Amino acid sequence: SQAWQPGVAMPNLYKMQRMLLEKCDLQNYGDSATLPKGIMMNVAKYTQLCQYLNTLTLAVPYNMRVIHFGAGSDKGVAPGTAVLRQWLPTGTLLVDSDLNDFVSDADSTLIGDCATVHTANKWDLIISDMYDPKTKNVTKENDSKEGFFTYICGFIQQKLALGGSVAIKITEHSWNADLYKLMGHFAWWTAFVTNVNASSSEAFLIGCNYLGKPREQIDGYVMHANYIFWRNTNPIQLSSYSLFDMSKFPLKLRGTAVMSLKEGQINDMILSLLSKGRLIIRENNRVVISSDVLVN
Amino acid sequence: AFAVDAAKAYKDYLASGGQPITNCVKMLCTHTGTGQAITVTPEANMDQESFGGASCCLYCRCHIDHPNPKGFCDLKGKYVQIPTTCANDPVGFTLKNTVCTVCGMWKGYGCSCDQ
Numbered sequence: 001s002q003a004w005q006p007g008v009a010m011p012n013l014y015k016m017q018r019m020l021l022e023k024c025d026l027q028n029y030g031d032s033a034t035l036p037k038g039i040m041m042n043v044a045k046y047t048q049l050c051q052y053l054n055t056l057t058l059a060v061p062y063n064m065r066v067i068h069f070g071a072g073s074d075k076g077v078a079p080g081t082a083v084l085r086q087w088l089p090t091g092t093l094l095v096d097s098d099l100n101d102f103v104s105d106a107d108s109t110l111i112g113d114c115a116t117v118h119t120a121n122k123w124d125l126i127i128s129d130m131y132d133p134k135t136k137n138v139t140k141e142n143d144s145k146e147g148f149f150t151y152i153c154g155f156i157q158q159k160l161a162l163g164g165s166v167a168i169k170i171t172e173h174s175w176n177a178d179l180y181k182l183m184g185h186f187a188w189w190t191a192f193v194t195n196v197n198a199s200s201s202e203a204f205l206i207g208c209n210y211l212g213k214p215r216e217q218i219d220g221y222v223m224h225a226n227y228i229f230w231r232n233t234n235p236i237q238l239s240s241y242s243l244f245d246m247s248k249f250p251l252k253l254r255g256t257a258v259m260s261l262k263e264g265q266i267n268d269m270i271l272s273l274l275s276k277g278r279l280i281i282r283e284n285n286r287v288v289i290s291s292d293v294l295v296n
Numbered sequence: 297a298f299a300v301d302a303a304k305a306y307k308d309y310l311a312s313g314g315q316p317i318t319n320c321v322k323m324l325c326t327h328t329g330t331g332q333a334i335t336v337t338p339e340a341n342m343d344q345e346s347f348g349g350a351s352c353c354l355y356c357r358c359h360i361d362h363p364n365p366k367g368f369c370d371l372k373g374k375y376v377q378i379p380t381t382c383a384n385d386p387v388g389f390t391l392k393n394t395v396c397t398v399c400g401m402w403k404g405y406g407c408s409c410d411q
């Protein structure tokens with residue numbers, strides 16, 4: 001049983017199919033998991049995401065740079081960044097953002113649409129919880145969505161360090177074909193469903209160890225259809241079991257090497273180190289961010 | 297000479313029977329930690345709960361200035377351990393209580409330096 005894992009990752013064989021997109025109909029659609037006393041869904045969800053990310057070959061440099069989009073809640077706090085900050089090595093630079101105002105444990109927070117966010121540096125890990133409930137129009141064709149997904153795709157291509165990783169929230173209706181295609185630019189990728197929210201079509205699209213070029217060609221419409229087919233035919237038993245064992249929670253500080261190489265220096269040898277979670281390619285200057293403000 | 301006193305207004309609102317500030321961010325943790333008051337990662341012992349610090353700061357939560365010249369927050373970006381019996385109101389707890397500068401424990405909730 002997978003009830004003791006933090007969640008379920010999409011099996012590779014489902015990734016290789018060519019299904020057509022149909023409506024997502026989850027067996028366990030009605031149910032909820034029993035959370036430990038006083039624990040919020042979004043703390044439990046981010047805890048399980050981080051527990052699963054502990055099993056991947058994440059690059060963990062000194063001066064890890066992490067940015068978290070969609071980090072506010074409708075009560076004005078940031079439960080996800082509180083978990084990320086618990087997970088990440090002490091001293092990790094953590095930047096926060098959301099459309100609406102909130103108070104945060106991140107080292108810096110920007111308020112506004114994500115498209116107004118600019119950074120000088122590159123990043124080692126990008127986390128996104130952004131989601132628009134207005135996409136859940138069951139009465140119409142589920143097409144690839146734009147909006148913040150357009151920003152995220154460009155932000156990965158321009159500001160993710162080689163070797164870095166990504167976890168971007170999707171749902172049945174909140175998804176983007178280019179983001180799936182971008183998954184083929186990592187050494188490995190999956191769609192991960194937390195056990196605590198398994199009654200939802202939510203998944204985190206995870207790109208592990210960015211390579212900056214297409215390692216494989218992924219049609220994003222087909223892959224989202226494959227993702228739904230997997231969810232439709234593989235009910236996941238809701239479970240909070242993994243939340244009760246936090247003894248191994250913190251991200252291992254691997255001291256991954258950072259180097260500044262340009263493009264012509266990235267061999268198959270470098271690509272191989274990137275692929276194994278053993279190298280980060282970016283500058284290690286000061287981290288500078290800003291938010292664009294429109295005046296009247 | 298005027299200055300709003302949110303700490304007093306919250307204490308007085310608590311005394312008059314008002315519901316505490318909610319949605320403080322409680323963390324999952326082992327509950328085998330050092331039990332110290334304000335730490336860089338959750339450190340609750342068996343008798344404590346650990347919360348994300350910013351969510352437990354009255355000034356952070358009310359969007360008002362922090363009462364010191366450099367308007368610095370000693371909770372934001374850290375974790376605060378709250379005795380389980382008081383975890384229904386972490387904001388009030390951090391307001392009313394003091395951290396021993398030698399123990400790192402809460403005075404009267406773990407500090408044993410005065411024995």
Ligand SMILES: Nc1ncnc2c1ncn2[C@@H]1O[C@H](CSCc2cc(C(=O)O)cc(-c3cccc(O)c3)c2)[C@@H](O)[C@H]1O
Nearest residue numbers: 070071072073098099100112113114129130131132133148
């Ligand atoms: N373009 C963008 N730029 C920057 N931040 C962005 C952008 N888009 C979205 N966000 C941010 O992502 C966070 C997660 S969405 C939370 C949610 C979930 C559900 C869900 O699960 O049913 C539902 C809602 C919801 C429910 C009723 C009315 C309503 O109006 C919304 C909200 C969030 O704080 C939001 O501000």
Ligand SMILES: [Zn+2]
Nearest residue numbers: 353355356369
């Ligand atoms: Zn504060």
Ligand SMILES: [Zn+2]
Nearest residue numbers: 396399407409
């Ligand atoms: Zn003491």
